[PDB]
Amino acid sequence: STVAISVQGLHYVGTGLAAIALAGVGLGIGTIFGNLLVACARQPNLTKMLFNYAILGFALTEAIGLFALMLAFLMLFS
Amino acid sequence: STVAISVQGLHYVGTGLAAIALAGVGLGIGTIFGNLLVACARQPNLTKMLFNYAILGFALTEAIGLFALMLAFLMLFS
Amino acid sequence: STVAISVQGLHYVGTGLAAIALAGVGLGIGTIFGNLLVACARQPNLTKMLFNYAILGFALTEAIGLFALMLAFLMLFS
Amino acid sequence: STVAISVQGLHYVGTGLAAIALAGVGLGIGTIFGNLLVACARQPNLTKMLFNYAILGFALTEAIGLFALMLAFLMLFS
Amino acid sequence: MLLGGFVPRRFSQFNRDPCWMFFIFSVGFWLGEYPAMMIKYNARDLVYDPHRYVWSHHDDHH
Amino acid sequence: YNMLVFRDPKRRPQLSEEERAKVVVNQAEWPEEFKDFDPDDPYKNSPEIIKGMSSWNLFLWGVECAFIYQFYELVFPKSI
Amino acid sequence: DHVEKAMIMRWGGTLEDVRKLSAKDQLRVRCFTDIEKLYSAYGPKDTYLQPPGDTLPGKDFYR
Amino acid sequence: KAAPKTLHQVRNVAYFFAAWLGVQKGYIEKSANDRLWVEHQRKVRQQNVERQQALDSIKLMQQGV
Amino acid sequence: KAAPKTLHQVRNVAYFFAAWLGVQKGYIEKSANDRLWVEHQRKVRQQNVERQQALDSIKLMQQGV
Amino acid sequence: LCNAASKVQARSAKKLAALTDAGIQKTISEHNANGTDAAVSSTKRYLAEQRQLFHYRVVRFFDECHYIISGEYFAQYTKVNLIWDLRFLTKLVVLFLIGTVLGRQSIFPPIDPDSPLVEALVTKVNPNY
Amino acid sequence: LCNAASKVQARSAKKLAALTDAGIQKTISEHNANGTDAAVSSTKRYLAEQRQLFHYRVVRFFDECHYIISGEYFAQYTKVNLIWDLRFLTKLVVLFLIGTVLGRQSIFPPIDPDSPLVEALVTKVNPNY
Amino acid sequence: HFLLLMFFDFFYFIFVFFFYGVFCYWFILFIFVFCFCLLFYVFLYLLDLFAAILQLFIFCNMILQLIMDFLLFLLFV
Ligand SMILES: CCCCCCCCCCCCCCCCCC(=O)OC[C@H](COP(=O)([O-])OCC(O)COP(=O)([O-])OC[C@@H](COC(=O)CCCCCCCCCCCCCCCCC)OC(=O)CCCCCCCCCCCCCCCCC)OC(=O)CCCCCCCCCCCCCCCCC
Ligand SMILES: CCCCCCCCCCCCCCCCCC(=O)OC[C@H](COP(=O)([O-])OCC(O)COP(=O)([O-])OC[C@@H](COC(=O)CCCCCCCCCCCCCCCCC)OC(=O)CCCCCCCCCCCCCCCCC)OC(=O)CCCCCCCCCCCCCCCCC
Ligand SMILES: CCCCCCCCCCCCCCCCCC(=O)OC[C@H](COP(=O)([O-])OCC(O)COP(=O)([O-])OC[C@@H](COC(=O)CCCCCCCCCCCCCCCCC)OC(=O)CCCCCCCCCCCCCCCCC)OC(=O)CCCCCCCCCCCCCCCCC
Ligand SMILES: CCCCCCCCCCCCCCCCCC(=O)OC[C@H](COP(=O)([O-])OCC(O)COP(=O)([O-])OC[C@@H](COC(=O)CCCCCCCCCCCCCCCCC)OC(=O)CCCCCCCCCCCCCCCCC)OC(=O)CCCCCCCCCCCCCCCCC
Ligand SMILES: CCCCCCCCCCCCCCCCCC(=O)OC[C@H](COP(=O)([O-])OCC[N+](C)(C)C)OC(=O)CCCCCCCCCCCCCCCCC
Numbered sequence: 006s007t008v009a010i011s012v013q014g015l016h017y018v019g020t021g022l023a024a025i026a027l028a029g030v031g032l033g034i035g036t037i038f039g040n041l042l043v044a045c046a047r048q049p050n051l052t053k054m055l056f057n058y059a060i061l062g063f064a065l066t067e068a069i070g071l072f073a074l075m076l077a078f079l080m081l082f083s
Numbered sequence: 084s085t086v087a088i089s090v091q092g093l094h095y096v097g098t099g100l101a102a103i104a105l106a107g108v109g110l111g112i113g114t115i116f117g118n119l120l121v122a123c124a125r126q127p128n129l130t131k132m133l134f135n136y137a138i139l140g141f142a143l144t145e146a147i148g149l150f151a152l153m154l155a156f157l158m159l160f161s
Numbered sequence: 162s163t164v165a166i167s168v169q170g171l172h173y174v175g176t177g178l179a180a181i182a183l184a185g186v187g188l189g190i191g192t193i194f195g196n197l198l199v200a201c202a203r204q205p206n207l208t209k210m211l212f213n214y215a216i217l218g219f220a221l222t223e224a225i226g227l228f229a230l231m232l233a234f235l236m237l238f239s
Numbered sequence: 240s241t242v243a244i245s246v247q248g249l250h251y252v253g254t255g256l257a258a259i260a261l262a263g264v265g266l267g268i269g270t271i272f273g274n275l276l277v278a279c280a281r282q283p284n285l286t287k288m289l290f291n292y293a294i295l296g297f298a299l300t301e302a303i304g305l306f307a308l309m310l311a312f313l314m315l316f317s
Numbered sequence: 318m319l320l321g322g323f324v325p326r327r328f329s330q331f332n333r334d335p336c337w338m339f340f341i342f343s344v345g346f347w348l349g350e351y352p353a354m355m356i357k358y359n360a361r362d363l364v365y366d367p368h369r370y371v372w373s374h375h376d377d378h379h
Numbered sequence: 380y381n382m383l384v385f386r387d388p389k390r391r392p393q394l395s396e397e398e399r400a401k402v403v404v405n406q407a408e409w410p411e412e413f414k415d416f417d418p419d420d421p422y423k424n425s426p427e428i429i430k431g432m433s434s435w436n437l438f439l440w441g442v443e444c445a446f447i448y449q450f451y452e453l454v455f456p457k458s459i
Numbered sequence: 460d461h462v463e464k465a466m467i468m469r470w471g472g473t474l475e476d477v478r479k480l481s482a483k484d485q486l487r488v489r490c491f492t493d494i495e496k497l498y499s500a501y502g503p504k505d506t507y508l509q510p511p512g513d514t515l516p517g518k519d520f521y522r
Numbered sequence: 523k524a525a526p527k528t529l530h531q532v533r534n535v536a537y538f539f540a541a542w543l544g545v546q547k548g549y550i551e552k553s554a555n556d557r558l559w560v561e562h563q564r565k566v567r568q569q570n571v572e573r574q575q576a577l578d579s580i581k582l583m584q585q586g587v
Numbered sequence: 588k589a590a591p592k593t594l595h596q597v598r599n600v601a602y603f604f605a606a607w608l609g610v611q612k613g614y615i616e617k618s619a620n621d622r623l624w625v626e627h628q629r630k631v632r633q634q635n636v637e638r639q640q641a642l643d644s645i646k647l648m649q650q651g652v
Numbered sequence: 653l654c655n656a657a658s659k660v661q662a663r664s665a666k667k668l669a670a671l672t673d674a675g676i677q678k679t680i681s682e683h684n685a686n687g688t689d690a691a692v693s694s695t696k697r698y699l700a701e702q703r704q705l706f707h708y709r710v711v712r713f714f715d716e717c718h719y720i721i722s723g724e725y726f727a728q729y730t731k732v733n734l735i736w737d738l739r740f741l742t743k744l745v746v747l748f749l750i751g752t753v754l755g756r757q758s759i760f761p762p763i764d765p766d767s768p769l770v771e772a773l774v775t776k777v778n779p780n781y
Numbered sequence: 782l783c784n785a786a787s788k789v790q791a792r793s794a795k796k797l798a799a800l801t802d803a804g805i806q807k808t809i810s811e812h813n814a815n816g817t818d819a820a821v822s823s824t825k826r827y828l829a830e831q832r833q834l835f836h837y838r839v840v841r842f843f844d845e846c847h848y849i850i851s852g853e854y855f856a857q858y859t860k861v862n863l864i865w866d867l868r869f870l871t872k873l874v875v876l877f878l879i880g881t882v883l884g885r886q887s888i889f890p891p892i893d894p895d896s897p898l899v900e901a902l903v904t905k906v907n908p909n910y
Numbered sequence: 911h912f913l914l915l916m917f918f919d920f921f922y923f924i925f926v927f928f929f930y931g932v933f934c935y936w937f938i939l940f941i942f943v944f945c946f947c948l949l950f951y952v953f954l955y956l957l958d959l960f961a962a963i964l965q966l967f968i969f970c971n972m973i974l975q976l977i978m979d980f981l982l983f984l985l986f987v
């Protein structure tokens with residue numbers, strides 16, 4: 006027989022999963038700053054150019070985080 | 084047939100999943116405060132600058148942590 | 162007996178799983194930049210060729226994240 | 240009693256799971272380029288040769304991600 | 318292998334070689350088919366088929 | 380220069396600076412097609428294959444062909 | 460072939476039934492099929508899912 | 523380079539901008555009307571569904587199972 | 588006065604004539620459709636009048652004068 | 653069908669000969685000798701000049717904007733400038749109205765579903781239009 | 782908002798100076814000295830020339846008609862003329878289709894009242910359109 | 911090819927049914943989306959072109975590796 010069911014609590018589960026991807030982003034941030042300090046110690050003269058590149062890496066990694074976050078919020082309110 | 088179902092306790096599950104996002108955030112902080120020691124020991128004269136960058140990275144990671152925390156609380160009290 | 166069931170809200174679950182695929186992509190991107198800083202700090206004259214390769218790696222990694230994101234949006238609209 | 244049930248929406252769940260395989264592939268690709276940058280700064284004379292090997296590794300690693308993505312399409316389109 | 322050949326510097330030079338003339342004709346076809354589809358498939362008088370719910374590919378492949 | 384992925388080939392110099400400086404340029408002997416020759420635009424003075432046929436005219440011809448291909452059935456529909 | 464199948468199934472289930480229509484009607488139906496092709500998976504689903512309360516014919520119209 | 527005796531270019535730009543603004547006004551009005559009609563059609567379908575359900579309920583009562 | 592190397596003017600005139608002929612075709616088609624719809628509406632009104640007359644006749648019979 | 657064509661050609665020839673513009677006559681004679689079309693050549697020359705004057709238009713636009721913003725334009729304001737500005741305002745208004753009509757793709761505002769005029773839409777003689 | 786305007790003006794000025802056309806540069810210099818607009822003057826010149834060349838167009842049309850009717854055009858027919866005629870035919874066809882669409886004021890043919898598609902007209906989401 | 915087909919379908923949809931936004935006040939969003947779609951189109955075509963050749967290379971290299979695994983070389987004296 007044809008049965009159609011609509012569960013109204015499964016828009017929460019999908020939202021939680023989309024938030025998990027943030028960990029892969031947050032950890033990625035620490036890695037960039039984990040190695041930035043070492044690079045600064047190795048070559049203190051480039052404290053500026055390295056910092057700019059690290060900001061570029063953080064922004065791009067955060068861009069992935071916000072792409073995932075968009076799915077998280079869409080399914081939370083829909 | 085058209086059947087609509089509303090499962091009440093699934094708002095807890097979504098909350099729990101978002102908490103896992105903190106696993107990476109907490110780990111990412113440890114990476115920063117791990118390399119910081121190595122950077123300081125290698126170049127103790129630059130502790131202040133390295134310490135400031137470590138704080139910067141911690142703030143950026145914490146931002147993602149709050150994003151996940153925000154989703155968890157919303158799905159907890161909704 | 163033959164029973165056919167159609168669960169609606171499952172597409173939210175599948176979409177959230179695909180979002181997790183961005184965890185490695187975000188982490189992978191962060192790894193590239195972290196390695197880039199070390200290479201620049203250990204060979205400061207190559208601040209452009211390394212930057213180009215970092216961009217190339219990001220593009221490929223972004224491509225993988227976009228392949229998954231297509232499924233994430235597609236299932237969300239299925 | 241013998242009851243046979245056919246749930247349609249499950250194909251979304253399996254599709255999302257396969258997308259998780261891209262997390263390893265995307266991370267794996269970033270690992271290769273990270274080593275490439277850290278290797279070009281140790282022996283820049285071979286940068287062209289290393290870049291060639293990096294690309295070969297990218298495809299082999301990328302090839303696996305396609306296998307998973309194929310399964311996602313198979314179940315998403317069936 | 319993309320080694321050499323005539324390469325027009327800009328659009329106006331595409332008429333300096335028959336092959337590029339055919340190429341630009343093809344590009345014109347390619348890009349001008351899209352506006353045609355815009356006008357044809359977003360027309361005011363365009364009407365959905367009343368019997369569209371009688372049958373669809375979705376039920377057939379299912 | 381480039382047109383999409385098609386790059387214009389460039390002839391490598393063969394003369395040294397000393398020998399090159401001693402060369403006397405006489406554009407009077409050059410063909411009319413190549414005078415004031417510019418590496419960045421060598422075909423500026425090149426003749427048209429068909430007189431009066433511009434590139435834009437061909438582009439518009441292709442666009443008109445597309446419009447015909449998409450609109451002919453609207454004016455002369457045929458039964459199945 | 461797909462266009463002809465759509466026209467036949469949606470307008471009688473037989474070739475003669477389709478031929479009973481005029482050329483303009485066939486043009487309209489085929490252009491709607493083109494619309495459906497263009498929408499694919501990225502578009503509204505009311506083109507093939509009948510909303511509740513719709514007065515248009517259902518699947519059992521010709522049965 | 524003396525001061526310009528005419529302002530043709532600025533006037534042409536203003537003409538284009540005015541036409542564009544009018545187009546935006548018309549587009550906004552049409553979009554609002556379309557949304558209103560979509561909502562009206564949805565309400566009509568809902569009312570039809572309710573009427574059909576009421577008729578089915580009355581027929582069920584007549585069935586008297 | 589040498590022979591013309593181009594036929595631009597004739598081509599332009601032909602372009603205008605072709606556009607005009609297409610316009611005539613469209614106008615004829617639209618006029619025919621409008622006439623058909625006018626006749627259909629007239630028939631609908633006539634049918635409505637006949638239905639009203641039949642209803643009035645039935646009501647008259649119910650009156651039974 | 654032929655006499656009329658001959659008469660029209662003769663009239664046009666007389667008018668063409670009548671004009672006493674040295675440049676126009678010279679161009680006509682040259683094109684007739686070469687067998688080419690003068691009007692088409694003029695069109696192509698104008699299009700080429702406009703294509704080569706686009707950035708000149710941009711520079712003039714910026715210069716005029718600076719002239720107006722600096723207040724120098726209003727310093728020498730006269731009645732003629734007032735007339736031109738009134739013409740400019742009229743064109744702006746008519747263009748705005750035309751733009752609105754095209755934007756909504758209808759001369760009149762669309763009828764809302766709740767309006768009592770909906771019946772008129774239902775009772776259209778030709779629903780296609 | 783201002784830096785972008787300055788950058789655009791500078792780019793246009795560089796491009797305007799780059800061109801090596803003696804006539805264009807001379808006209809630009811003259812208009813700048815006089816403070817007038819070169820593009821507008823060119824437009825007015827072109828319109829005046831076209832206004833003075835209308836009867837020239839008529840005479841050329843009649844001459845071309847005589848040339849074609851006399852059969853001299855087909856005597857020297859070549860492949861280039863074939864290409865031009867194909868272009869001409871394509872433009873004629875597209876213009877005819879556009880003319881029909883405008884004449885009936887609808888992309889698609891109107892639906893007859895007896896057609897089964899009338900229901901679609903009745904079920905329009907927005908009757909205004 | 912699956913990915914190419916899906917992306918081309920999406921590009922066709924947005925180009926045809928949302929180009930009117932160029933004339934509207936949200937034209938900037940459409941322009942950004944269109945530029946992104948063009949970039950993705952170019953990237954996908956380049957990636958596929960490279961990957962086809964690379965896969966053929968690998969396909970032949972597997973066979974050659976099979977052959978080489980059992981080859982024995984003698985030394986000239
Ligand atoms: C560098 C890259 C090159 C390409 C690489 C490969 C491809 C890559 C992919 C992308 C390619 C993009 C497209 C190619 C470029 C096209 C533009 C171009 O170069 O033209 C130069 C061209 C000059 O070249 P030329 O060879 O020196 O031409 C000499 C003369 O044209 C003289 O020519 P003629 O002697 O043959 O004259 C023929 C005749 C014939 O002239 C005409 O017929 C004029 C045209 C009339 C309109 C016909 C339709 C035009 C097409 C529209 C749709 C286009 C769709 C495709 C666009 C795709 C763009 C991405 O002319 C006249 O008689 C004069 C016309 C006077 C009439 C004016 C009034 C017209 C009214 C129209 C009424 C209809 C309106 C609609 C509503 C009607 C309602 C009832 O400049 C123009 O004239 C352009 C005018 C039109 C502009 C808009 C066109 C559409 C949008 C184009 C965007 C391009 C973006 C590029 C970005 C690059 C960044 C680096
Ligand atoms: C609902 C939305 C639907 C949207 C649909 C899609 C919309 C379009 C999308 C794009 C589609 C693809 C592109 C197609 C482009 C086709 C057009 C094109 O490229 O044109 C260039 C093309 C020239 O290109 P070419 O050959 O490369 O030119 C070389 C040189 O550039 C030549 O340079 P030039 O120096 O020669 O430059 C001037 C030249 C170039 O000027 C232009 O470019 C003109 C504008 C070009 C666009 C035209 C689009 C037309 C589309 C249909 C109409 C829409 C409204 C147009 C308003 C135009 C206002 C000026 O001017 C002309 O072309 C002149 C044409 C008019 C000739 C007038 C002669 C009448 C003589 C009558 C004698 C009768 C005697 C009867 C005696 C009987 C005795 C028994 O020109 C034309 O095709 C002109 C067509 C004009 C048609 C007008 C029809 C009006 C309606 C019928 C008349 C009703 C009222 C009067 C009735 C009176 C009683 C009979
Ligand atoms: C349903 C049926 C409804 C029917 C309604 C009624 C229909 C009309 C019936 C009659 C009504 C009474 C008569 C009214 C006539 C009004 C027109 C008139 O006389 O014009 C002459 C008048 C010049 O007369 P004048 O001042 O005596 O000229 C002195 C010299 O002759 C000057 O000589 P010249 O050498 O300068 O000659 C060239 C001149 C003359 O050329 C013409 O004559 C042009 C054609 C004239 C007719 C125009 C009619 C327009 C009507 C509405 C649109 C219909 C389609 C028009 C298609 C035109 C195709 C070319 O060209 C122009 O006018 C250029 C105008 C375009 C300027 C483009 C600049 C854009 C800059 C944008 C920068 C944005 C930066 C943003 C940064 C933001 C940062 C935060 O020109 C205009 O008014 C031009 C208006 C153009 C409006 C275009 C609007 C298009 C739609 C909006 C844009 C959407 C797409 C793009 C969006 C992009 C994103 C923003
Ligand atoms: C001898 C008797 C005198 C009168 C006696 C008293 C009254 C007696 C009662 C009867 C009076 C009849 C009317 C008076 C005559 C009017 C014609 C005239 O002489 O004009 C010369 C005039 C040249 O005089 P001019 O002072 O040397 O002008 C210098 C230049 O014009 C340069 O001017 P500018 O420097 O000021 O430039 C301004 C600017 C401004 O230029 C423009 O804006 C050009 C005009 C654009 C169109 C605007 C609407 C035009 C009006 C249409 C409605 C008229 C209704 C009233 C007509 C009644 C006729 C009985 O120009 C431009 O930028 C160039 C324009 C480039 C754009 C071209 C493309 C336009 C596209 C239009 C798009 C819109 C179309 C609608 C659909 C849109 C859908 C989205 O020639 C033209 O330019 C005429 C063009 C228009 C022709 C058709 C006009 C309607 C029909 C007239 C029939 C007259 C029959 C007379 C029979 C006599 C037998 C012996
Ligand atoms: C006594 C003698 C009397 C003689 C009378 C002669 C009367 C002639 C009347 C006009 C005839 C016109 C015929 C041609 C037009 C036919 C239109 C048609 O059938 O369209 C339907 C067909 C389409 O058929 P369709 O309608 O089945 O296709 C629709 C398909 N869907 C639904 C999917 C969209 O149109 C075309 O095929 C258009 C193709 C273009 C036509 C023009 C080609 C011009 C040349 C271009 C190539 C060369 C370029 C070279 C450039 C480089 C040079 C160096």
Ligand SMILES: CCCCCCCCCCCCCCCCCC(=O)OC[C@H](COP(=O)(O)OCCN)OC(=O)CCCCCCCCCCCCCCCCC
Pocket residue numbers: 352355356357359360361363545549754755757910929930932933934
């Ligand atoms: C980088 C920029 C330049 C790049 C150039 C590249 C080439 C592009 C060439 C573009 C050619 C034209 C494009 C046409 C777009 C679509 C036109 C169309 O048919 O849309 C109108 C359509 C009418 O239908 P509607 O009733 O709104 O709803 C239909 C649902 N069944 O309704 C809609 O779709 C809604 C439209 C609302 C917004 C209107 C914007 C335009 C307003 C002025 C138009 C004036 C046109 C005048 C032409 C006259 C034609 C006779």
Ligand SMILES: CCCCCCCCCCCCCCCCCC(=O)OC[C@H](COP(=O)(O)OCCN)OC(=O)CCCCCCCCCCCCCCCCC
Pocket residue numbers: 610614781883884886
């Ligand atoms: C000596 C000559 C020159 C003299 C010049 C003197 C100045 C004259 C200026 C004229 C200006 C334009 C005149 C406009 C005429 C009327 C236009 C109009 O609104 O008519 C369209 C109308 C639509 O309505 P319809 O559905 O047919 O029925 C309505 C009944 N409720 O339907 C009708 O009315 C039927 C029309 C059928 C015939 C159509 C003919 C035109 C075909 C091409 C039109 C192209 C217009 C493109 C403009 C685009 C606008 C965005």
